[PDB]
Amino acid sequence: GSMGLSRVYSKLYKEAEKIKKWKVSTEAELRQKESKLQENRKIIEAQRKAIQELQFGNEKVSLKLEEGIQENKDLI
Amino acid sequence: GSMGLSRVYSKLYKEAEKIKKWKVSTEAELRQKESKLQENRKIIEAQRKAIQELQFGNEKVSLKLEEGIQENKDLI
Amino acid sequence: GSMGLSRVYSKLYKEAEKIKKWKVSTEAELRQKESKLQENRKIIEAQRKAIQELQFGNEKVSLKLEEGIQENKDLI
Amino acid sequence: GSMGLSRVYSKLYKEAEKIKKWKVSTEAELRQKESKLQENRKIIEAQRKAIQELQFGNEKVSLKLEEGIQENKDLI
């Protein structure tokens, strides 16, 4: 056991490699999750405005149909 | 035949009565036909204006339906 | 005045002519009034059925508009 | 410098603490990003189906309006 420090040294090297590798891995996954979150915010805002416009349109159509009913019903 | 003129006279009286009666009859029927003709002109003008108003209404209803279709179709 | 009867005779002839002429005149006017009355009945029945069909149509249009309103209003 | 190893030892302890702390931090942020991504998928699928139903409704309304126009236009 005249080389305990060489074994400590070798062990520390391997652990540093595992930790560096973990860093690379976890950061990369973070950037991918963040990227796809940003994409998600875009899609969600898009769909929100779309639903808003569709419902506004349905209100306009309702007013026209009501006008047509008034006109028609004076005739009956 | 010492009274031929009395027979002429009696015959003329009867014919005058028949003609007077015919006058009364035909005039009365004329007034009734004229009366009901005037009624007919009223009904016909009434129905004419009614049909006019109904068709005008149908044009207004058509414009409203067309507007509603435009509004609806922008949404599809 | 040895010809009173000739004067009666001449007067009767003239009156018969006036009455015959009146007959022709009044009958002719009767046929014309009757003719135009019959025409009037045709026009009136025509317009009646027309108004009937138009109002029936307006009821059908009303049902369609009501259906369109139901469909539209579920969306709002 | 009779205690170089004590200084190595102390340094290693501090680095292990920094790395452990980093682990806690990055995992926690991962769980939060994943959580909010899952929420995002729910919202997006919800809005998708909503837009689908709204557009289907607009097609139904269009057919009704077209029927009403047919009915109306036979009248004009």
Curated annotation (Swiss-Prot), chains A, B, C, D:
A motif (Mediates head to head self-assembly of N-terminal ends) lies at residues 4-14. Testis. It is found in: Nucleus; Chromosome; Chromosome, Centromere. A motif (Nuclear localization signal) lies at residues 20-23. The molecule is in a coiled coil structure that is formed by 4 polypeptide chains. The N-terminal and C-terminal regions exhibit a prominent seven-residues periodicity. Major component of the transverse filaments of synaptonemal complexes, formed between homologous chromosomes during meiotic prophase. Required for normal assembly of the central element of the synaptonemal complexes. Required for normal centromere pairing during meiosis. Required for normal meiotic chromosome synapsis during oocyte and spermatocyte development and for normal male and female fertility. Structural component of synaptonemal complexes. Homotetramer that consists of an N-terminal four-helical bundle that bifurcates into two elongated C-terminal dimeric coiled coils. This tetrameric building block potentially self-assembles into a supramolecular zipper-like lattice to mediate meiotic chromosome synapsis. Self-assembly is likely initiated by local proton density at chromosome axis, which is predicted to trigger antiparallel back to back assembly of adjacent C-terminal ends into tetrameric structures that anchor to chromosomal DNA. This is Synaptonemal complex protein 1. It comes from Homo sapiens. The gene is SYCP1. The chain holds residues 101 to 173 of 976 of the full protein.
